[PDB]
Amino acid sequence: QKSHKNEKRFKCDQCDYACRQERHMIMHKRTHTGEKPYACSHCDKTFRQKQLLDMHFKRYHDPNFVPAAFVCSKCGKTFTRRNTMARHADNC
DNA sequence: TTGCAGTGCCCACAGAGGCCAGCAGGGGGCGCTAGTGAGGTGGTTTTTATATGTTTTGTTATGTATTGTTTATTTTCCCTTTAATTTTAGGATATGAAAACAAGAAT
Ligand SMILES: [Zn+2]
Ligand SMILES: [Zn+2]
Ligand SMILES: [Zn+2]
């Protein structure tokens, strides 16, 4: 098992992607064989993956969405994604 | 910019295996003692053995009694010669008993 320890332990039958964890195999499988049994309580949307889209539910319906400012350096403009702040800060 | 498909990372509870005290297995070496077992020494008696005294046994000498021996005085058997003692005539006695005589008595 030291061969399999901290490696791509679980192969996928349909495609050659591999993940270390089983949970990843169940989520990966649902994309190939569409089950999407997770459903926002306020809209029609049916989600494949777990509570990240339950976070969809939360935010799409909660007026307390509160987008984290995440202010940069001197210019100070706000962006919703970390990679954007790092790239624009490198030359700001 | 988002949904979708696929990846990264952080945690955490399991899982795992070395760490550790606890504890039980077989075996080595000592502390100490009850209880015989045997061996050696001392005492006792005892038993054999030895020596002394008394008595019993064996041997020797003297006296008495028994058997034998040639005398030796009976003694006893056998002669020839007397000394009573007996037997046989031969004469004499005696005492009896007739016989004769004499004396009474009778006829
Ligand atoms: Zn696949
Ligand atoms: Zn919704
Ligand atoms: Zn800036």
One-letter-per-residue 3-state SS of chain A = CCCCCCCCCEECCCCCCEECCHHHHHHHHHHHCCCCCEECCCCCCEECCCCHHHHHHHHHHCCCCCCCCCCCCCCCCCCCCHHHHHHHHHCC
Distance CA A62, CA A48 (A): 21
Q: Distances in Å between the alpha carbon of A63 and those of A56, A58, A70, A84? A: 13, 9, 19, 25
Resolution expressed in Å: 6.5
What kind of experiment solved this structure? cryo-EM
The amino acid at residue A72 is C
**Ligand with the closest atom to the CA of A85:** 3
- A88 CA distance to ligand 3 middle (Å): 6
**Residue that is written with structure tokens 């539910």 in the block:** A57
Whether A24 CB is under 7 Å from strand B:
yes
Residue A8 near residue A20 (C-beta atoms within 8 A): yes
Residue A22 near residue A10 (C-beta atoms within 8 A): yes
Length of chain A equals 92
